[PDB]
Amino acid sequence: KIEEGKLVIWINGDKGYNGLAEVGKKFEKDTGIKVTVEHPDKLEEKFPQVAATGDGPDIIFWAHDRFGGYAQSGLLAEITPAAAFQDKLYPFTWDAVRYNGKLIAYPIAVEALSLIYNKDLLPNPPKTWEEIPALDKELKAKGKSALMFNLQEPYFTWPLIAADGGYAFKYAAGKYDIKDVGVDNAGAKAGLTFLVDLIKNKHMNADTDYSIAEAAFNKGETAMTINGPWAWSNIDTSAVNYGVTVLPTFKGQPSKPFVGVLSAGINAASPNKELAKEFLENYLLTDEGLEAVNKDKPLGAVALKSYEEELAKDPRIAATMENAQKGEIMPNIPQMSAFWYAVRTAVINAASGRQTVDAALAAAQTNAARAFAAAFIDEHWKELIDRVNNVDPILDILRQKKVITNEDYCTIRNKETPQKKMRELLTGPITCAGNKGKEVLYDALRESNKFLMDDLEDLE
Numbered sequence: 001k002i003e004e005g006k007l008v009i010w011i012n013g014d015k016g017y018n019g020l021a022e023v024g025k026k027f028e029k030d031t032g033i034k035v036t037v038e039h040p041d042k043l044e045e046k047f048p049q050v051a052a053t054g055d056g057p058d059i060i061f062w063a064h065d066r067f068g069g070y071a072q073s074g075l076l077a078e079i080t081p082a083a084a085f086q087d088k089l090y091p092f093t094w095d096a097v098r099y100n101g102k103l104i105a106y107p108i109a110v111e112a113l114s115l116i117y118n119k120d121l122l123p124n125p126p127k128t129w130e131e132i133p134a135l136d137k138e139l140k141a142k143g144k145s146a147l148m149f150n151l152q153e154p155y156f157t158w159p160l161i162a163a164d165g166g167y168a169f170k171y172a173a174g175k176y177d178i179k180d181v182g183v184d185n186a187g188a189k190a191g192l193t194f195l196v197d198l199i200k201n202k203h204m205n206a207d208t209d210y211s212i213a214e215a216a217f218n219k220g221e222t223a224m225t226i227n228g229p230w231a232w233s234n235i236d237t238s239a240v241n242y243g244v245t246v247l248p249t250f251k252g253q254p255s256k257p258f259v260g261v262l263s264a265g266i267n268a269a270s271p272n273k274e275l276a277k278e279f280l281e282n283y284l285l286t287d288e289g290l291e292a293v294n295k296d297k298p299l300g301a302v303a304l305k306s307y308e309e310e311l312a313k314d315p316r317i318a319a320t321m322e323n324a325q326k327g328e329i330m331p332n333i334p335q336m337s338a339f340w341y342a343v344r345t346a347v348i349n350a351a352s353g354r355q356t357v358d359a360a361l362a363a364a365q366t367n368a369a370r371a372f373a374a375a376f377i378d379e380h381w382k383e384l385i386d387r388v389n390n391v392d393p394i395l396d397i398l399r400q401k402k403v404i405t406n407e408d409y410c411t412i413r414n415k416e417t418p419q420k421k422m423r424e425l426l427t428g429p430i431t432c433a434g435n436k437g438k439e440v441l442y443d444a445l446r447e448s449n450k451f452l453m454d455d456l457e458d459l460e
């Protein structure tokens, strides 16, 4: 399990993890408690898997939107800061980590996407998305491009989808309504259509990811990118003279980035909860602790009032907060991971021309409102049939969980190969047991065909 008397921290590989480890070394010097900082790939999807068995890190860092799902699953310990400490952070950052009345993490920093532009290539950046096609034509004439940013993560394309009316879950009467999903209204369709036309007309490439866009901007090959504060450090190191500014408007409306509060949660299974509290409150969330992390990769606008007063004078932070004000704080509700998966699928499918914009967003509207696991099954059902090897345990689990009947079990168990059993299952009783039946099937697959499931989720 988790080792007593030391701290293991998980944080994403784009953050200042080397600066965070320096805070860990100061902690160990004063206490004898070793602190190990790791940056596993896809840690936000690995954490609920390993923590459910009592494993994982003592502390997990991620934007707050994932933490409601974690807390609903019982994976996070309640945060209990004294009043003098709670006063040290902005109250709105505490609101981001409150779930069902309860603080479930320590807020660290406010993150929002901005437009980043090369001041030597583009002395005045475009105020509107609509002018970017013409700008790209001009820059292609000179051997450059207008704009490159990560098209593989919906976090980066959401500001444009939301600009003219898209939204995740409608907020009303103090609660999010998982009905009013707004990923398929006229504003969302217009934004994704504009994005998809950029790719169609060869102003962007559907295969551009984080590293490709970062490399191109930092080599001076593209005039603009979209990124967060963590990216400024690498541009500082490049030769690019860059500015950070408000995102372009679409149909006269501001782009609306989803605002994330980088947060540190304590594993409910950790035997080191008191050491973790001490590290986070007395070492990390101080002027010198946050400065060490921020010097490695900028955090954005920090939750710690005393340090934020210094950072707020940076014009790049002013741009971050200007974009933050035009966007929305992300919900932390458990449905957020289903929302993100739905929008990720829609953008990839529409950008490749595999689906029309309208069909992509119609699926996203349905998928955002149901469990992640159900959409996962529906999106991989052909691969499941072709690759599963171990079907009898699945049937046993489905029968004992009452998804299928005794007759179903005997009928399917009688077939000769795993592919035939799986096809009868997926086109028979699994189509008839709602989303819940597909969620039970997903759990059964992870108990019986874990490598297949890990590979399909790209966790291996």
Ligand SMILES: OC[C@H]1O[C@H](O[C@H]2[C@H](O)[C@@H](O)[C@@H](O)O[C@@H]2CO)[C@H](O)[C@@H](O)[C@@H]1O
Residues within 6 Å of the ligand: 012, 014, 044, 063, 064, 065, 066, 111, 153, 154, 155, 156, 260, 340
């Ligand atoms: O793209 C979906 C993704 O968006 C957000 O993740 C951000 C994260 O907040 C930033 O700190 C940075 O690491 O970039 C990520 C996008 O690659 C959500 O926090 C995340 O839950 C969601 O899956």
